[PDB]
Amino acid sequence: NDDKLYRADSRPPDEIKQSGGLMPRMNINLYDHARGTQGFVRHDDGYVSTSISLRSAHLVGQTILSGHSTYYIYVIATAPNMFNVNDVLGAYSPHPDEQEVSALGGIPYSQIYGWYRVHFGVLDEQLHRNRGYRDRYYSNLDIAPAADGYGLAGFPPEHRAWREEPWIHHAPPGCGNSNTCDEKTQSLGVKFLDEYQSKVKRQIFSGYQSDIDTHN
Amino acid sequence: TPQNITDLCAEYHNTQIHTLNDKIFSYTESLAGKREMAIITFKNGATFQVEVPGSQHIDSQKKAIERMKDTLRIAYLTEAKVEKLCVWNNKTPHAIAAISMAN
Amino acid sequence: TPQNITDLCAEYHNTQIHTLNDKIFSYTESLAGKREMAIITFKNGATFQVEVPGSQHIDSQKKAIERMKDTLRIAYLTEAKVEKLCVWNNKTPHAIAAISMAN
Amino acid sequence: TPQNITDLCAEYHNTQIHTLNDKIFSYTESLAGKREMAIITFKNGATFQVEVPGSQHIDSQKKAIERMKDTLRIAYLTEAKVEKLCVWNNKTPHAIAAISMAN
Amino acid sequence: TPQNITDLCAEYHNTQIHTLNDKIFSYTESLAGKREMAIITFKNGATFQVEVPGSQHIDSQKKAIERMKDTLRIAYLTEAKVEKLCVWNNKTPHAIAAISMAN
Amino acid sequence: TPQNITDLCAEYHNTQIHTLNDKIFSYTESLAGKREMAIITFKNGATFQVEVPGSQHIDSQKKAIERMKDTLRIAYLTEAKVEKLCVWNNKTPHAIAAISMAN
Ligand code: NA
């Protein structure tokens, strides 16, 4: 659907275009990402957080990015790299009041609808639309369902969540049933990131090859 | 001149409009002798073909056959929604005469 | 030699610019004999074609007609914003003589 | 006409269906004289070629061979899951006759 | 043989290297008769063309002019940085002999 | 018929393998007469041409040269990891006989 998420970020539009998108600070673990300490807005352990509304992300910047003259609130389209943190971590969600939606891998540049500017903690009335934004593609897409994230929860190997529903039925080998659990959570996330990035390259590089004219 | 696919399609006998509003499920392609052709499917089992260039096709049609195989391959890969296909139903699989793509 | 699409279009009789500043809403392609063409629309309903190659065109234009159909497809599937079309206004739908993309 | 890739393969002698369901691991292409070809591999080791054009091929096959190499490069760069190849098993490596892409 | 664009440009008389180091602001192509050309610009106002094929081009150049119009269209659409253009300064706008792109 | 780029390269005297495991850093393209070519580079400084269609090419080698320039252009813009290049080490800069792409 055409839904949209929101993220305060110190990094300006030009650096984001240069990096290919909104990248995380490679460890991939959703639990560590979510409980990570927050001078810059949650982008640790292989993920980058966002918020459900434009007003809840503005507030997020106005605590974390207090002491920044200028930051940005990037408006992001929803795609199946996003995970609802409260849905995937259940009662063990460390900061449930934040209503997080974390992009495993980052938010590619095509996924970024645009960005508001913020000066001395005041929002810009209007949006800077992104020339690389893809409205049709990303509007036929949605957040990943919680079932895709339960196996990527990233709970410690002997956490009680791994012997509890829904997580037992998605639990990586070594997680409640050597670093087997830790290495598998990493690799299952590296695979999920690899297959999502495969799918976006399918979308964008196929368009770049809608060039071809066999007959000519 | 027709302004859309439905009206273009109705100029031709033994055609019919298929309204799918879905991305192509699978794309097949062959270079085997006498079978230099393409074949798409959709979720629901619907199967269609770009015909082998033969005796039913004029020269301007052979150019556009090669183009349709380009369009269809790349439309499959982009996962573009296909509104409608005008097809010929005197063949099996139904042979594509036109396609329209839209959100 | 012209510097932009607006000045190019002003060199021809029966042409006019149609500014769209919008991506293509739909792409329609046909290999039906004597309707080997493309038809694009936009969200506002505006409709254009790439003519079927006929006697109205010179030799060098044929290569360019096929090029333009390539452009419209890649423009459609990459969601590129179309700036302007130069079109012949004495066909229905209006027939694309040129295209600019920007912004 | 055959309804799908498996039917198409059953029409020729010296052929078989290879069922991959994986992206292409490696795309190789050569312009070196008398080795004008492609070669693809998958992570199970399976290696295939698009044969250099020769006297085994009829004239209509010339175009489809060029398309197929295009198709394999597009498929590689897009990491498109290849469902099945129809392959001539009388060559080493097996020579690609047709391809289907799904999921 | 020349190693880079600047060395290649230096072989031909009546040329100059423009360093742009920017993606292309606009791409424009025409299929209208006697103006079968492309025209690109940059944010700073620099305009360039790929010339209409004519008697100044030998036959080897013909397929390269078509390759260059492909390159400029997909350069624009990808938002790829054009480092430099080698251009004939004797035409208005300056005609493109070559292009380099760098990250 | 070889199953990979290393063995294919070894069939020719006057070739050698570079293994880059790296994307292309720059793509260059010329339509200037008698230098209808492409040039690529890498981070490590390494430079390669696709030769101008000249004297020491056949007929079917002319088509594969065009396909190779297609390959390098799209590889450059997709940031495709080039595994290896088999190159004619007696041209300066070395000219690409083949490419392999994995990763
Ligand atoms: Na969405």
Side-chain angles (χ1 to χ4, degrees), chain A residues 1-16 18-39 41-54 56-61 63 65-116 118-121 123 126-128 130 132-162 164-176 178-182 185-198 200 202-215, chain B residues 1-102, chain C residues 1-42 44-61 64-80 82-102, chain D residues 1-33 35-42 44-61 64-80 82-103, chain E residues 1-12 14-15 17-33 35-42 44-62 64-80 82-83 85-90 92-103, chain F residues 1-33 35-54 57 60-61 64-80 82-102:
Chain A
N1 277 1
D2 80 336
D3 305 319
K4 263 120 196 161
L5 307 163
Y6 301 98
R7 136 149 253 232
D9 206 311
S10 75
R11 299 176 291 207
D14 77 280
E15 157 167 354
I16 293 302
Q18 183 181 83
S19 299
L22 289 149
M23 269 5 114
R25 228 196 280 205
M26 162 150 105
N27 217 135
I28 287 155
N29 173 310
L30 177 62
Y31 183 59
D32 292 354
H33 156 71
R35 71 199 175 92
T37 304
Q38 239 195 341
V41 176
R42 227 160 237 114
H43 80 6
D44 268 299
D45 301 284
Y47 285 89
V48 9
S49 74
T50 77
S51 343
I52 302 297
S53 72
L54 182 53
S56 61
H58 181 198
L59 230 201
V60 122
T63 119
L65 310 174
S66 291
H68 269 161
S69 273
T70 311
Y71 63 90
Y72 302 84
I73 299 169
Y74 291 85
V75 180
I76 299 119
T78 61
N81 64 341
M82 301 324 258
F83 288 109
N84 197 309
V85 171
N86 296 176
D87 297 344
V88 174
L89 301 188
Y92 314 109
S93 187
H95 301 285
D97 290 290
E98 295 169 5
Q99 309 162 114
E100 229 111 36
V101 174
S102 293
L104 174 19
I107 302 120
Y109 189 60
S110 55
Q111 198 175 345
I112 314 194
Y113 178 62
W115 48 88
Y116 294 90
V118 177
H119 185 134
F120 304 154
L123 243 165
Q126 245 271 103
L127 240 147
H128 196 155
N130 177 29
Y133 175 62
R134 245 68 160 177
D135 196 43
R136 189 160 60 262
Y137 176 67
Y138 282 110
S139 298
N140 309 331
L141 290 183
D142 286 307
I143 262 136
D148 290 345
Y150 296 146
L152 304 167
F155 288 117
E158 61 252 278
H159 202 310
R160 66 132 127 186
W162 298 126
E164 263 164 30
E165 285 182 63
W167 299 283
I168 346 88
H169 312 320
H170 298 68
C175 304
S178 157
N179 328 272
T180 304
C181 181
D182 259 47
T185 281
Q186 177 63 20
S187 68
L188 286 174
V190 160
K191 195 189 183 262
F192 185 101
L193 173 53
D194 177 49
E195 294 259 299
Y196 182 76
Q197 283 193 186
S198 279
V200 180
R202 192 179 133 162
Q203 170 53 216
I204 277 122
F205 305 157
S206 302
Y208 290 165
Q209 300 172 102
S210 53
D211 205 77
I212 286 131
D213 191 326
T214 305
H215 205 246
Chain B
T1 326
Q3 294 214 252
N4 55 84
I5 186 153
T6 291
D7 284 338
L8 192 148
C9 203
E11 297 175 346
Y12 296 90
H13 70 306
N14 306 141
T15 66
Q16 95 191 93
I17 278 282
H18 281 41
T19 305
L20 292 312
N21 286 300
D22 197 12
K23 70 206 212 198
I24 294 142
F25 187 69
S26 75
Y27 173 85
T28 291
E29 190 176 283
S30 166
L31 63 76
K34 263 70 171 201
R35 288 297 188 246
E36 302 84 7
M37 72 175 299
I39 298 172
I40 67 177
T41 74
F42 290 85
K43 258 153 51 199
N44 70 345
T47 306
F48 314 101
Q49 63 152 318
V50 174
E51 290 165 299
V52 169
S55 327
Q56 67 246 90
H57 306 158
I58 71 195
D59 285 333
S60 64
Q61 238 180 306
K62 278 137 178 219
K63 211 181 281 267
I65 273 153
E66 295 306 292
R67 168 174 298 279
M68 185 66 74
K69 295 180 285 203
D70 293 335
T71 284
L72 284 191
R73 165 180 65 191
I74 211 79
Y76 161 69
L77 289 161
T78 48
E79 304 177 59
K81 198 175 274 157
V82 172
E83 192 213 27
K84 300 158 177 292
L85 296 162
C86 172
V87 304
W88 281 288
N89 63 17
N90 58 7
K91 296 280 135 89
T92 191
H94 291 186
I96 297 165
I99 176 160
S100 68
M101 295 186 281
Chain C
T1 310
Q3 304 254 39
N4 57 70
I5 199 183
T6 289
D7 287 339
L8 186 146
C9 211
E11 289 177 287
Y12 295 87
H13 290 156
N14 315 126
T15 56
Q16 88 188 36
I17 284 308
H18 197 111
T19 302
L20 298 148
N21 299 315
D22 193 15
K23 73 197 186 234
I24 299 162
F25 172 77
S26 78
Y27 172 90
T28 291
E29 177 185 302
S30 162
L31 59 72
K34 315 297 199 208
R35 295 288 194 219
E36 302 101 347
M37 67 189 293
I39 302 168
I40 52 156
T41 74
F42 292 79
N44 63 8
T47 307
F48 318 89
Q49 52 156 333
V50 176
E51 286 187 292
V52 167
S55 60
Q56 69 248 67
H57 312 126
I58 41 162
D59 206 305
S60 52
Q61 285 195 268
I65 284 160
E66 297 303 298
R67 164 167 303 284
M68 179 64 73
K69 283 174 287 192
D70 298 323
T71 294
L72 297 189
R73 189 176 52 207
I74 188 154
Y76 174 66
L77 285 180
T78 64
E79 306 188 44
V82 172
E83 196 207 26
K84 306 186 184 264
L85 296 170
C86 173
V87 304
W88 292 282
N89 50 35
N90 80 333
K91 341 273 176 34
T92 322
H94 288 181
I96 289 155
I99 179 170
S100 50
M101 286 178 288
Chain D
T1 304
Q3 258 36 224
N4 58 73
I5 203 191
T6 301
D7 285 16
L8 198 143
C9 216
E11 300 193 282
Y12 308 85
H13 299 114
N14 309 105
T15 65
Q16 56 180 283
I17 289 301
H18 276 29
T19 299
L20 294 302
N21 286 298
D22 198 21
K23 65 196 185 150
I24 293 153
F25 179 73
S26 102
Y27 173 84
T28 287
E29 132 180 337
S30 158
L31 56 66
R35 288 297 196 226
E36 305 104 326
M37 70 187 315
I39 306 171
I40 56 159
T41 62
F42 296 81
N44 63 351
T47 302
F48 312 97
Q49 63 174 296
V50 176
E51 288 174 299
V52 180
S55 44
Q56 73 250 76
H57 297 127
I58 68 170
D59 206 52
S60 76
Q61 239 168 319
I65 286 162
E66 292 297 290
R67 173 177 294 285
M68 184 63 80
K69 291 173 282 193
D70 283 1
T71 293
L72 295 184
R73 185 186 57 227
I74 313 317
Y76 169 72
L77 297 162
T78 50
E79 310 184 20
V82 177
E83 200 214 4
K84 293 175 183 221
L85 294 162
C86 176
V87 306
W88 274 288
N89 60 23
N90 68 342
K91 297 285 144 59
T92 311
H94 291 151
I96 290 173
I99 178 172
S100 70
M101 299 203 267
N103 311 138
Chain E
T1 261
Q3 305 299 312
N4 78 125
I5 194 168
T6 299
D7 286 3
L8 188 140
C9 210
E11 297 180 304
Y12 301 91
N14 315 113
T15 70
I17 286 284
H18 289 111
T19 311
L20 300 302
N21 272 290
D22 193 24
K23 71 205 201 64
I24 303 174
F25 182 80
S26 75
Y27 171 86
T28 290
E29 61 172 59
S30 156
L31 69 90
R35 288 273 176 279
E36 289 93 340
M37 42 144 29
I39 299 168
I40 71 159
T41 74
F42 296 80
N44 64 264
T47 287
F48 310 100
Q49 72 176 307
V50 190
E51 290 211 69
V52 169
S55 63
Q56 80 268 260
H57 316 128
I58 51 171
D59 284 346
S60 69
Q61 291 189 268
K62 293 285 215 310
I65 290 164
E66 299 314 308
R67 175 168 297 282
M68 182 60 62
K69 293 186 285 214
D70 294 331
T71 291
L72 291 181
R73 176 178 52 199
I74 192 50
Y76 166 68
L77 294 171
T78 47
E79 305 198 87
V82 184
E83 177 189 77
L85 293 165
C86 169
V87 308
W88 289 284
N89 46 243
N90 68 181
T92 320
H94 297 337
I96 295 164
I99 181 180
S100 58
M101 290 183 273
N103 303 292
Chain F
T1 291
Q3 292 199 112
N4 57 83
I5 195 173
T6 290
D7 295 353
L8 187 158
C9 211
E11 304 188 345
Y12 304 85
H13 212 249
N14 101 285
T15 41
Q16 77 200 183
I17 285 289
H18 296 308
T19 128
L20 286 314
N21 298 305
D22 190 20
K23 64 183 184 65
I24 297 152
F25 172 83
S26 96
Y27 178 85
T28 285
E29 202 182 273
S30 166
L31 63 87
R35 292 295 199 282
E36 297 91 10
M37 70 195 287
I39 296 156
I40 69 178
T41 65
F42 286 84
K43 293 190 288 173
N44 65 3
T47 304
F48 301 105
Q49 57 165 320
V50 173
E51 276 172 85
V52 176
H57 306 115
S60 68
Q61 221 178 346
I65 283 158
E66 296 304 285
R67 144 181 316 282
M68 181 60 68
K69 292 177 279 192
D70 286 352
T71 296
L72 301 185
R73 189 179 56 209
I74 196 54
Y76 170 75
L77 300 152
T78 44
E79 310 196 296
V82 178
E83 189 206 46
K84 288 151 184 279
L85 295 183
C86 177
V87 307
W88 288 305
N89 63 17
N90 76 325
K91 310 298 186 303
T92 298
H94 296 357
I96 299 185
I99 181 168
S100 81
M101 228 148 23

